[PDB]
């Protein structure tokens, strides 16, 4: 029931730019890809433009585009993310790594021309030099998670909560608690949803012809009502 639904009927080019500071280690990541919300499909490649990434790539996956979720027709009235477009929304997160530090992210997600842009500032603090994050003990993979969206009618936005389980290379799990807030950038109306969730599956790979520190990401995202 929004104008934003119509900007995503096709393949949309995607740009991501991130400035990061984790425990004084500063770093930048650029990403390009393609989005096809008809099939909740994202294809992305990310490159650390400042050298080697001081954290594990799986820890950045959630930070690096839920407006490409596929909402089923009987649920399109609950798609906040597209309803904010093209002016966009601000996405903020606190990500609490269990027994370790935490990321704090602020992201502006909007269209620039025909290109969907994710611009992200990230600051991580209180990480243990030899935890699973700074000591790079996380496996290069990703499990499937459900994200629970809730309307936040007082801020004209949504609240989302979920837990990621990073596999550690000894077989254990490193827990990342995500606390997320989205807010429209514009004045216009947005779709405030009933409670629902996004089902996400991600696949991480390498580009065989790339020598810079990088991550290829494939992600499918479908909404699911209750
Ligand atoms: Ca309702």
UniProtKB/Swiss-Prot annotation:
Modification comment: Contains a chromophore consisting of modified amino acid residues. Maturation of the chromophore requires nothing other than molecular oxygen.
Effect noted on mutating residue 30 to R: In mut1.28; shifts fluorescence lifetime from 3.03 to 2.76 ns. In mut2.2; shifts fluorescence lifetime from 3.03 to 1.94 ns. In mut3.3; shifts fluorescence lifetime from 3.03 to 1.88 ns
Effect of residue 219 to G: Suppresses the 399 nm excitation peak, leaving only the longer wavelength peak at 475 nm
Annotated tissue distribution: Photocytes.
Domain of life: Eukaryota
SUPFAM superfamilies: GFP-like
Biotechnology: Green fluorescent protein has been engineered to produce a vast number of variously colored mutants, fusion proteins, and biosensors. Further generation of mutants led to more stable proteins (at 37 degrees Celsius for example) with brighter fluorescence and longer fluorescence lifetimes.
Result after altering residue 168 to L: In R10-3; matures to the red-emitting state with excitation and emission maxima at 555 and 585 nm, respectively
Coiled coil ranges: none
Entry keyword set: Chromophore, Luminescence, Photoprotein
Pfam families: GFP
Listed result of changing residue 203 to V: In EBFP1.2; shifts the excitation and emission spectra to shorter wavelengths and increases quantum yields compared to BFP
One GO process term, biological-process aspect: bioluminescence
Keyword field contains Cell wall biogenesis/degradation: no
Annotated phenotype, changing residue 39 to N: In EBFP1.2; shifts the excitation and emission spectra to shorter wavelengths and increases quantum yields compared to BFP
Outcome following mutation: residue 195 to I: In mut2.1; shifts fluorescence lifetime from 3.03 to 2.50 ns
Claim: Zinc-finger is one of the keywords in the record: no
Outcome reported for the amino acid change (mutating residue 46 to L): In mut3.3; shifts fluorescence lifetime from 3.03 to 1.88 ns. In R10-3; matures to the red-emitting state with excitation and emission maxima at 555 and 585 nm, respectively
Effect of residue 152 to V: In EBFP2.0; shifts the excitation and emission spectra to shorter wavelengths and increases quantum yields compared to BFP
Recorded consequence of changing residue 147 to I: In Azurite; shifts the excitation and emission spectra to shorter wavelengths and increases quantum yields compared to BFP
Similarity field: Belongs to the GFP family.
Subunit record text: Monomer.
Function: Energy-transfer acceptor. Its role is to transduce the blue chemiluminescence of the protein aequorin into green fluorescent light by energy transfer. Fluoresces in vivo upon receiving energy from the Ca(2+)-activated photoprotein aequorin.
Protein name: Green fluorescent protein
Native species: Aequorea victoria
Organism lineage string: Eukaryota, Metazoa, Cnidaria, Hydrozoa, Hydroidolina
